[PDB]
Amino acid sequence: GSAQADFDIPAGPLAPALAHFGQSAHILLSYPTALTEGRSTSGLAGRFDIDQGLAILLAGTGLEASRGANASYSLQASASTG
Known part of the structure; x- marks a missing residue:
């Protein structure tokens, strides 16, 4: 995790939020x-x-994401989606 960009995702499922985030991100x-x-x-x-x-x-x-040093993050879930 260390890539900045322009993002565009509404309150959507997490999976595709990241799938959509990393795209523009x-x-x-x-x-x-x-x-x-x-x-x-x-x-x-x-x-x-x-x-x-x-x-x-x-x-x-x-949720909660555990960042990395390769731009490859990994998620963590404390009481998912609240």
């Missing part, structure tokens, strides 16, 4: 479907950092 996301098949989240849409964007997209939505 050039970010990489390591998450199971298992997790995603339950994660719905706020959306991200702005010119920011992996951190911020991720954190936006990941805004308090039952």
Whole structure:
């Protein structure tokens, strides 16, 4: 996690939020479907950092992402989607 860009994702499932985030964000996301098949989240849409964007997209939505140093993040879920 260390790629800043312009984001555009509404309060959508987490999986595709990241799948859509990393697209415009050039970010990489390591998450199971298992997790995603339950994660719905706020959306991200702005010119920011992996951190911020991720954190936006990941805004308090039952989730939490463990950043990396290769642009490849990994998710964590404390009471998924709240």
